[PDB]
Amino acid sequence: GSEAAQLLEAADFAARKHRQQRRKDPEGTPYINHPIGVARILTHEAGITDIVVLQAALLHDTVEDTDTTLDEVELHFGAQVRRLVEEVTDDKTLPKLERKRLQVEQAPHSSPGAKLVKLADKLYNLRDLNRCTPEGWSEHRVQEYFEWAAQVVKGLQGTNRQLEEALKHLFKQRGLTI
Amino acid sequence: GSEAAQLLEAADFAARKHRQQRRKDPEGTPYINHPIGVARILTHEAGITDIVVLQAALLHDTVEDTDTTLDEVELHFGAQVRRLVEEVTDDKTLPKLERKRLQVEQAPHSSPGAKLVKLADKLYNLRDLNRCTPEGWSEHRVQEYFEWAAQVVKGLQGTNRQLEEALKHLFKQRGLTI
Ligand SMILES: [Mn+2]
Ligand SMILES: [Mn+2]
């Protein structure tokens, strides 16, 4: 009913599903901080106000890494949100390398909404990598992540000038172009 | 900027400040889940849409338990929010028993916004206690909390029918009236 209630519903849902999950930083930061930050990037830097998109950002990793079904997502947020979540859900049954290939291949075919979420997700992760190296990650692994990230972003271009410029800038710092 | 951006700003701010904090439940759930749950109570059950009140709910424990100053809160959310946060910040320099006494005495003198946050905070904590006994907590300590909570809520009455009825019901189950 309310825009405020809608956002809190998604945040709460995500917080509960990710309650046992943590990031790979030395402090093992609560995972929920990530979805929240991704959504925030969209409102503050991308100027996104579409509630459907913001909810998908908050829930973008729920079906992927937690005990959540597509039906459950549609039940609480509608088919529009569920569909976006589908587009941003990696297939965890595939080898890591294969998943990376899929993201690159699927990038251009994503809906505008999914492209926004994918862009914000990448921006949050690159900034986080620049801020702190994940536990057990070599510098080569970080650079590798950026290289792969570039492959994906190139397919998401023409969606949001603010996010793309920010991403392009961070990529340039590591010798990567668009 | 926008209602969406405003909620996410508070959510993000609180998530970062509470990143190292955890609830007292067995699994040690990320503390951020509590403020998110309190604000959600306000939108979903109390029907609150006032962005200022919802932000205060999300930040209700920031100055109290984290490295956050009143000025920092005002800087990011304005004086209105900082004021509400002030009203809901317990003095951690006081012995626990004194803090409990303070909340009881202060209840009736709180502003409408502050009474809403206090009511939602209590409802979340009572439900949580009914759902799971905190680690190292005896059943008598659980009951003690309810008795104390009843004293505080009695002074917050006449603010929101939905929250007050819910609280009244939970209190009655444990032999406590209003
Ligand atoms: Mn993500
Ligand atoms: Mn609280």
Swiss-Prot record, chains A, B:
InterPro entries: HD/PDEase_dom, HD_domain, MESH1. It is an enzyme of class 3 (hydrolase). The keyword Manganese applies. The active site is at E64 (nucleophile), D65 (nucleophile). One of its GO terms (molecular function) is metal ion binding. The keyword Glycosyltransferase does not apply. PROSITE patterns: HD. Its EC number is 3.1.7.2. Its cofactor is Mn(2+). Residues 31-126 form the HD domain. Mn(2+) binds at H34, H60, D61, D121. SUPFAM superfamilies: HD-domain/PDEase-like. The modification N-acetylglycine is found at G1. It catalyses: guanosine 3',5'-bis(diphosphate) + H2O = GDP + diphosphate + H(+). Changing R23A: Abrogates ppGpp hydrolase activity. Keywords: Acetylation, Hydrolase, Manganese, Metal-binding. Gene3D superfamilies: Hypothetical protein af1432. The modification N6-acetyllysine is found at K24, K96, K122. Pfam families: HD_4. Changing E64A: Abrogates ppGpp hydrolase activity. ppGpp hydrolyzing enzyme involved in starvation response. Belongs to the MESH1 family. This is Guanosine-3',5'-bis(diphosphate) 3'-pyrophosphohydrolase MESH1.
